[PDB]
Design a protein around this motif. Structure first.
Motif, mmCIF file in Angstrom:
data_model
loop_
_atom_site.group_PDB
_atom_site.id
_atom_site.type_symbol
_atom_site.label_atom_id
_atom_site.label_comp_id
_atom_site.label_asym_id
_atom_site.label_seq_id
_atom_site.Cartn_x
_atom_site.Cartn_y
_atom_site.Cartn_z
ATOM 1 N N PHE A 227 34.472 51.419 31.124
ATOM 2 C CA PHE A 227 34.315 52.863 30.957
ATOM 3 C C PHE A 227 33.728 53.489 32.223
ATOM 4 C CE2 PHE A 227 31.711 56.554 29.433
ATOM 5 C CZ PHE A 227 32.750 57.382 29.051
ATOM 6 N N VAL A 228 32.768 52.790 32.837
ATOM 7 C CA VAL A 228 32.180 53.160 34.137
ATOM 8 C C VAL A 228 33.277 53.238 35.211
ATOM 9 C CG1 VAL A 228 30.624 52.346 35.996
ATOM 10 C CG2 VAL A 228 29.824 52.356 33.643
ATOM 11 N N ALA A 229 34.185 52.262 35.185
ATOM 12 C CA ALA A 229 35.360 52.224 36.060
ATOM 13 C C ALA A 229 36.359 53.345 35.774
ATOM 14 C CB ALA A 229 36.046 50.866 35.964
ATOM 15 N N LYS A 230 36.506 53.693 34.494
ATOM 16 C CA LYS A 230 37.398 54.773 34.059
ATOM 17 C C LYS A 230 36.896 56.164 34.458
ATOM 18 C CE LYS A 230 39.752 52.370 30.283
ATOM 19 N NZ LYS A 230 41.120 52.957 30.170
ATOM 20 N N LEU A 231 35.575 56.322 34.548
ATOM 21 C CA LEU A 231 34.955 57.591 34.949
ATOM 22 C C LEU A 231 35.037 57.833 36.451
ATOM 23 C CD1 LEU A 231 31.643 57.289 32.878
ATOM 24 C CD2 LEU A 231 33.316 59.098 32.429
ATOM 25 N N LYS A 232 34.549 56.862 37.226
ATOM 26 C CA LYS A 232 34.396 56.972 38.682
ATOM 27 C C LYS A 232 35.717 57.198 39.421
ATOM 28 C CE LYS A 232 30.075 54.371 39.055
ATOM 29 N NZ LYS A 232 29.450 53.031 39.225
ATOM 30 N N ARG A 233 36.755 56.460 39.016
ATOM 31 C CA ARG A 233 38.101 56.601 39.571
ATOM 32 C C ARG A 233 38.962 57.614 38.799
ATOM 33 N NH1 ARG A 233 38.205 50.265 39.851
ATOM 34 N NH2 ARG A 233 35.976 50.665 39.515
ATOM 35 N N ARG A 234 38.344 58.258 37.804
ATOM 36 C CA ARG A 234 38.994 59.199 36.874
ATOM 37 C C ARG A 234 40.293 58.686 36.221
ATOM 38 N NH1 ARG A 234 37.992 63.228 34.052
ATOM 39 N NH2 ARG A 234 36.139 64.519 34.389
ATOM 40 N N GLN A 235 40.216 57.471 35.681
ATOM 41 C CA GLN A 235 41.278 56.898 34.855
ATOM 42 C C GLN A 235 41.250 57.546 33.463
ATOM 43 O OE1 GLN A 235 41.657 52.473 35.131
ATOM 44 N NE2 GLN A 235 42.485 52.581 33.045
ATOM 45 N N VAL A 236 40.046 57.890 33.002
ATOM 46 C CA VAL A 236 39.846 58.627 31.750
ATOM 47 C C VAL A 236 39.919 60.143 32.006
ATOM 48 C CG1 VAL A 236 37.288 58.596 31.737
ATOM 49 C CG2 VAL A 236 38.547 58.655 29.561
ATOM 50 N N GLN A 237 40.608 60.851 31.107
ATOM 51 C CA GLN A 237 40.922 62.269 31.287
ATOM 52 C C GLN A 237 40.708 63.105 30.011
ATOM 53 O OE1 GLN A 237 45.163 60.569 32.319
ATOM 54 N NE2 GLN A 237 45.497 62.713 31.727
ATOM 55 N N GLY A 238 40.042 64.257 30.157
ATOM 56 C CA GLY A 238 39.774 65.181 29.044
ATOM 57 C C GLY A 238 38.563 64.787 28.213
ATOM 58 N N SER A 239 37.623 65.725 28.069
ATOM 59 C CA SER A 239 36.334 65.527 27.363
ATOM 60 C C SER A 239 36.446 64.921 25.970
ATOM 61 C CB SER A 239 35.557 66.839 27.290
ATOM 62 O OG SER A 239 36.274 67.810 26.571
ATOM 63 N N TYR A 240 37.508 65.301 25.262
ATOM 64 C CA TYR A 240 37.872 64.749 23.959
ATOM 65 C C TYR A 240 38.039 63.221 23.983
ATOM 66 C CZ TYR A 240 41.697 63.208 20.784
ATOM 67 O OH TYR A 240 42.512 62.489 19.941
ATOM 68 N N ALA A 241 38.673 62.715 25.041
ATOM 69 C CA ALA A 241 38.901 61.283 25.213
ATOM 70 C C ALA A 241 37.638 60.524 25.636
ATOM 71 C CB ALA A 241 40.040 61.032 26.195
ATOM 72 N N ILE A 242 36.847 61.135 26.522
ATOM 73 C CA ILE A 242 35.559 60.576 26.987
ATOM 74 C C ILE A 242 34.585 60.365 25.826
ATOM 75 C CG2 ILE A 242 33.443 61.206 28.249
ATOM 76 C CD1 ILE A 242 36.691 62.030 29.906
ATOM 77 N N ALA A 243 34.532 61.355 24.935
ATOM 78 C CA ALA A 243 33.730 61.287 23.719
ATOM 79 C C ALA A 243 34.128 60.123 22.809
ATOM 80 C CB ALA A 243 33.806 62.601 22.962
ATOM 81 N N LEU A 244 35.440 59.967 22.586
ATOM 82 C CA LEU A 244 36.005 58.893 21.757
ATOM 83 C C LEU A 244 35.619 57.497 22.246
ATOM 84 C CD1 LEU A 244 39.651 60.214 21.167
ATOM 85 C CD2 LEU A 244 38.081 59.598 19.310
ATOM 86 N N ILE B 72 35.170 65.300 15.331
ATOM 87 C CA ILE B 72 35.953 65.470 16.550
ATOM 88 C C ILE B 72 37.460 65.462 16.230
ATOM 89 C CG2 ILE B 72 36.476 64.453 18.839
ATOM 90 C CD1 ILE B 72 33.348 63.547 18.673
ATOM 91 N N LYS B 73 37.851 64.688 15.216
ATOM 92 C CA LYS B 73 39.234 64.639 14.718
ATOM 93 C C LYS B 73 39.712 65.985 14.168
ATOM 94 C CE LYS B 73 41.124 60.171 14.424
ATOM 95 N NZ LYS B 73 42.541 59.723 14.525
ATOM 96 N N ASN B 74 38.824 66.681 13.458
ATOM 97 C CA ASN B 74 39.154 67.960 12.835
ATOM 98 C C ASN B 74 38.182 69.073 13.233
ATOM 99 O OD1 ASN B 74 41.533 67.171 11.067
ATOM 100 N ND2 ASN B 74 39.980 65.777 10.231
#
Lengths: 345, 345
Positions: B16-33, B134-136
């Protein structure tokens, strides 16, 4: 100067004085026409031979006319208009009797550099030109005004009293390419009858008519495209005295919502006088039309005013027969028609 | 505390640390999940037996997570949300182990008056409830939001990036009784692709689509009914960080024209943090996308920023799953979900 000399020769002075005081004469357009015919009778009948004695006599007649009726600005302006037309032709005549007179432009600065004929005929024709100008204003408005309003735009209108504005609105509705919704504030204590006739003439031409109570103005201001004023008299600073009731608040409502404000007027309607106080210039109404029964009217001190004033902070355009001008420029249009001395009669 | 203890048991921290720094993860909704599933893995796998040592460890993990990525507010909020759900149940548990606790309401004022179980199961269910929340969100928005917009009203929209707002707009267009024109600002350096997909999905549903360049916003503001924001993160003072480009100027344009501003958000999107400076919070873009050629880029120092901030002075409503709230009240909604200590991790 008194009316002791002009009594048997000129009778129509006193009948106009009677028409003003008891308000037998109605609408600035009509007041102007009468004063034109007064000055028509003054030149055609009188014997003077001297010019400076004549002009100062006219000044005193105009001074007495404005003291007889303060709301007759159209009376005061028409005299002032002919006064200046006279003064230019006299200054042209004095240059030929003595014998660069052309520096650059037609400026001011009267504090810097110092200084039988057909003059009467010119004075006659000068009145005739003023009449024709007052006869045709609408032609000069429509060419500037019907360029600024768009399709699907909603127009809110205080003062439905003006003959000038209604006829401007009908020429735009004649154009099949232009569609607009009309909101009309009622103006309860005075304008009511005129507002209802306004709504009738819009339906007669099949324009989307909407009658609005004076309370509901705020409840619509988010939806309003433009605001149009049916003014009676326009001033130096820009501001207007309008034909009665529910304008000032509407203009305040427009400015808060940043809705554009339009004004339709004439140059004869335009005044070289300055409104230093609204307290003096505005005429108040009759409280009889509000509330019946006089024994409660001992305790019910009701306030009603006819004429309404708008400060220059609100309106943006004054479309005349000449063109569209900004309130920060209108003074020049005034000085192009009336001289500086021709103010304090 | 380091990740030396959680390495063989928990591997997904570092991915997840790797997904943040290189921005592999996208959109606040997904980061929360992802952070939800992280805390799901943390409780399910770990052995603690003690409660206060556990909570402070979670605090340090959240502290390291926010230091790893500053724009992941949805990361920071979700942890803070569970932290408070934990803290209430611990304070309820301590009252039973010791043995009025009900003055009036659920207040604050922590500066005044002084002070085996199924706690872990409650912690498990607390995560599950957060997911379902977050789903609804859309169901909770549509019942408040689709009550405020009228027929023949034109809607201008910065940030077409939000999945939340587009789906709110499609539910309103589903109502055959409601008609509205949509203006969409492009947001050139970033939003362009997303704005074009936004315009495609509006045409797909047959809603009057209007694509606007970022220059032309002023040239339309007189005609605009309402403004809607697709925000990423909402704050204490009211203000928002939005999903990139051309919002701040549009809001400034709206306020000058006194056009209403709307905001669509979630409570997980809502943050208990305070934006003391925009300088720190806003993330800047890549100037590569503006101008080609690097030898002129020695002299062409170009400025581009992704995230855009709006001050609270402009927007009026924050319609969530709970309801519509004013920016001068939103702090209370925040404190109803996050505690005062759970800020500085």
């Amino acid at each position: 100067h008194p009316n002791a000399a002009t009594s048997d020769v000129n009778v129509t002075i006193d009948t106009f004085v009677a028409k003003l005081k008891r308000r037998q004469v109605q609408g600035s357009y009509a007041i102007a026409l009468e004063t034109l015919q007064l000055l028509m009778r003054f030149i055609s009948a009188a014997r003077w031979n001297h010019v400076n004695d004549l002009i100062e006599q006219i000044r005193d007649l105009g001074n007495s006319l404005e003291k007889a009726h303060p709301t007759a600005f159209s009376c005061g302006n028409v005299i002032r208009r002919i006064l200046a037309v006279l003064r230019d032709e006299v200054e042209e005549d004095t240059m030929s009797t003595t014998v660069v007179a052309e520096p650059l432009i037609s400026s001011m600065f009267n504090l810097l550099q110092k200084p039988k004929t057909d003059y009467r005929q010119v004075a006659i024709q000068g009145i005739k030109d003023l009449i024709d100008e007052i006869k045709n204003i609408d032609e000069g408005i429509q060419q500037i005004a019907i360029d600024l309003i768009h399709d699907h735009e909603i127009l809110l209108t205080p003062t439905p009293d003006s003959k000038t504005v209604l006829k401007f609105l009908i020429t735009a509705r004649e154009r099949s390419n232009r569609t607009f919704t009309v909101l009309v504030t009622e103006g309860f204590p005075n304008n009511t009858k005129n507002a209802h006739e306004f709504a009738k003439k819009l339906a007669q031409h099949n324009i989307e008519t909407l009658v609005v109570p004076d309370s509901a103005v705020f409840a619509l201001m988010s939806r309003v495209g433009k605001v149009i004023i049916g003014t009676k008299a326009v001033f130096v600073n820009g501001g207007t005295i309008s034909s009665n009731s529910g304008v000032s608040s509407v203009c305040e409502c427009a400015r808060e919502f940043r809705t554009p404000v339009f004004a339709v007027a004439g140059l004869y309607k335009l005044s070289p006088l300055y409104p230093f106080d609204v307290e003096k210039f505005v005429e108040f109404g009759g409280s009889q039309r509000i509330l019946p029964r006089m024994d409660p009217r001992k305790r019910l001190d009701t306030v009603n005013q006819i004429t309404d004033y708008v400060p220059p902070e609100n309106i943006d355009i004054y479309i005349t027969n000449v063109g569209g001008f900004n309130p920060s420029f209108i003074y020049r249009i005034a000085w192009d028609n009336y001289k500086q001395i021709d103010v304090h009669l």
